Amino acid sequence: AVVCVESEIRGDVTIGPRTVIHPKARIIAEAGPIVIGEGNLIEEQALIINAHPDNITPDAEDSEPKPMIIGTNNVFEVGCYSQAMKMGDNNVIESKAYVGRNVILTSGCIIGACCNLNTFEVIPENTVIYGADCLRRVQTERPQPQTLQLDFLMKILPNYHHLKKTMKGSS
């Protein structure tokens, strides 16, 4: 993976292969061990979080001892954060996506612009939300978890592949 010197990580994060983190990739995985996936591209200005501390104060039996995870082809773009997103296969997060706490991001997840993810909501597969229309379950089969949106994600991943080699060569 492209372990960029500018990619600011924090804590024990046993990453995976092909997890090209771009410059200024501020993250935090200390209170929760976030394992990276295979085939993503952590862009600039991101924010990976782990175990929302006592500022919010979870006064509901804080005995978490649970680590975050990632998946394949789930490249998150700039602006968008990552508040412990239990992703999967090809769950791309576009610009300025306000990542929510308990959103088990399944496949075919196209996190649109300025779409604040729903806390404690099981993000099923094959669903792309609309921008202004929050929670729009539009394109139930067009944004299909496999062969349609994941195929488009692997197609967008090609530019990420060329950029992965280019960033590994430019550094």
């Binding site: 610009s95 300025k96 430019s170």
Partner: protein
């Protein structure tokens, strides 16, 4: 040139940024100029805490997302997001906005604050855009466009040296 270099000027590989005359070099933003190009021009006015970066450099076999496209003497606001867009000259940008996918704005085309556009967006000359999806607010007045361009360059050169170390 006219853009007085700010004290906190920082970016990640900003190799494509012009020293625009009568402008104001603002801090707290970012620029991926080493990735691809950006069409910068003089007499413009850019705000701080922006999110600027080139989309791509036509990364496909044919022609994918281009670098950018913008103009001169434009009135750029703050916190906007630029991604796969094609802007024009003397355009009044919106605050905390976002560039739509494959966007295309002509010269003096006004932009609404916190607005975005859907895939394959377009805008006409001196045309005001709006909506979260690709929408048009209306049209911008040419007299008001040139006035905003001149006032933008004036205020840019005025507040450009404000602690711009």
């Amino acid at each position: 040139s006219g853009n007085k270099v700010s004290r906190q000027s920082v970016l990640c590989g900003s190799q494509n940024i012009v020293l625009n005359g009568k402008t104001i070099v603002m801090n707290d933003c970012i620029i991926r100029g080493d990735l691809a190009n950006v069409r910068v021009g003089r007499h413009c006015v850019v705000k701080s805490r922006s999110v600027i970066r080139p989309p791509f450099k036509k990364f496909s076999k044919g022609v994918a997302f281009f670098p950018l496209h913008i103009g001169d003497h434009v009135f750029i606001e703050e916190d906007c997001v630029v991604n796969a867009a094609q802007i024009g000259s003397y355009v009044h940008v919106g605050k905390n906005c976002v560039i739509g996918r494959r966007c295309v704005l002509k010269d003096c085309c006004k932009i609404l604050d916190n607005t975005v556009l859907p895939p394959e967006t377009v805008v006409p000359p001196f045309t005001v855009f709006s909506g979260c999806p690709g929408l048009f607010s209306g049209e911008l007045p040419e007299c008001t466009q040139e006035l905003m361009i001149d006032v933008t360059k004036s205020y840019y050169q005025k507040f450009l040296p404000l602690t711009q170390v």
